[PDB]
Paper text:
Ankyrins are a widely expressed scaffold protein family, which mainly function to link great varieties of functionally related but structurally diverse integral membrane proteins to the spectrin-based cytoskeletons. Each ankyrin contains an N-terminal membrane binding domain (MBD), which is composed of 24 ANK repeats and responsible for binding to diverse membrane targets. Following the MBD is an unstructured linker region of ~130 amino acid residues, followed sequentially by a ZU5-ZU5-UPA supramodule responsible for spectrin binding (SBD), a death domain (DD), and an intrinsically disordered C-terminal tail (CT) with varying lengths.
To ensure that we do not miss any possible residues forming the AI-c binding segment, we prepared a C-terminal 12 ANK repeats of AnkB followed by a 46-residue linker (aa 430–873), which covers a small part of AI-b, and solved the crystal structure of the protein at 1.95 Å resolution. The overall structure of our AnkB C-terminal 12 repeats-linker is very similar to that of AnkR_C12 (RMSD of 1.04 Å). However, our structure contains a longer linker folded back binding to the AnkB ANK repeats. A 20-residue linker (from Thr828 to Asp847 instead of 11 residues in AnkR_C12) is clearly defined, and this 20-residue linker extends to the repeat R18. Moreover, we observed a prominently positive-charged surface in the inner groove of R16-18 right next to Asp847, and the five residues following Asp847 are highly negatively charged and conserved (847DEEGDD852). We anticipate that this stretch of negatively charged residues is part of AI-c and involved in binding to MBD (likely R16-17 based on the length of the segment). In the AI-c folded-back structure, residues from AI-c form extensive hydrogen bonds with the residues in finger loops of ANK repeats. Perturbations of these hydrogen bonding interactions (e.g. the Asn834Lys substitution in AI-c or the Asn595Ala mutation in one of the ANK repeats finger loop) led to a few fold decreases in their bindings. Hydrophobic interactions also contribute to the AI-c autoinhibition. Met839 is buried in the hydrophobic pocket formed by Leu668 and Leu701; Leu843 interacts with sidechains of Leu597, Tyr630, and Ile635.
Residue numbers in the entry: 430 to 844
Amino acid sequence: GLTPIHVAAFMGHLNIVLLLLQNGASPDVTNIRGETALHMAARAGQVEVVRCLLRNGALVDARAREEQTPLHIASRLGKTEIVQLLLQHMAHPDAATTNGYTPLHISAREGQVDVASVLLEAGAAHSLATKKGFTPLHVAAKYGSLDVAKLLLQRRAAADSAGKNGLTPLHVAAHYDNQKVALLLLEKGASPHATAKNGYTPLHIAAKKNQMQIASTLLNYGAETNIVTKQGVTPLHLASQEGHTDMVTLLLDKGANIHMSTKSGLTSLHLAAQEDKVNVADILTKHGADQDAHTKLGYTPLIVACHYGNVKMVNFLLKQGANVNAKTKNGYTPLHQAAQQGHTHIINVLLQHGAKPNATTANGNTALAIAKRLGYISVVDTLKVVTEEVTTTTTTITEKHKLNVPETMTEVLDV
């Protein structure tokens, strides 16, 4: 709901602004958004109008929607000369919007390095946190504002400030793949060891995203390879699950322990088995991974690969000597797991490698019986030739097929 001074100011009609003020118009009337003529002059870049309104007594820090001052607006649009004028008229450099963004946060988000330089020289606090804990350095790390991040760190902004979930700017830069900012933070002294609330380090993130240069530099600054999240996950687990062979090799080269398992018993080799990462599995095997490590429920990598139907991983694990007749704690063999999931092609490989078709689970079922109850006619037709007949009765104990699945790793970085 505009008044005449709002219109004149937005349009930059300096003659009309003076005419209105000369006749007693108040510079502080607001429109429906709570904006004054100064908000609108700033948004439109009207440097001379801004100077005239300030010199004629306008409220410098009038608050509009989201508690925005004219300084927030000028900073967002990179109106350096208007930022300077507002600060010279006592605009508070640390004024915060309702979400906690200061003009410095805004300049880091928009990559306005000239505005950030003016704010920092005028005394803006360089490390105030938003509601979620983000400092301007966190924002620069999320939006890849390298030149603003350089300025912040030159003014000794805190490189290790941690948000609500414990994320440091280095976490944020790695997560958002802003690799120059990550490398700058480390060179300027950011800790390579910082842990989020769930235990993620920057090395975990680098390992998961195959950020080879970041991982190398972290390791050069002393980062540990054998640290765990709250679920027991290591950087090597993450690299292995994703198939990042060069990352797996780098972490092993730098001391990673190939035998570490998660909370539920998953080793790196289980995760390669889950994701069919045969080249990873080869490297892990050459570094001594136990081909028959068991999860908490008793899944070996081979039974895991049978569950997910990963025949290349099945063939690879069999050639390394994995036990084709291994049993989970409730008696599932590779054959039972493949039967339950309908994987006829895996059934045929397992039978060729000596899987025992009459093996029974703890409840007494063969693989044939499990596939039969679940309607995998192709599996039944294959196992029929090689399995002893059993009669199914209504009293037959059947398996809990939804429970009889391998453990999985679902933990992720908390952003």
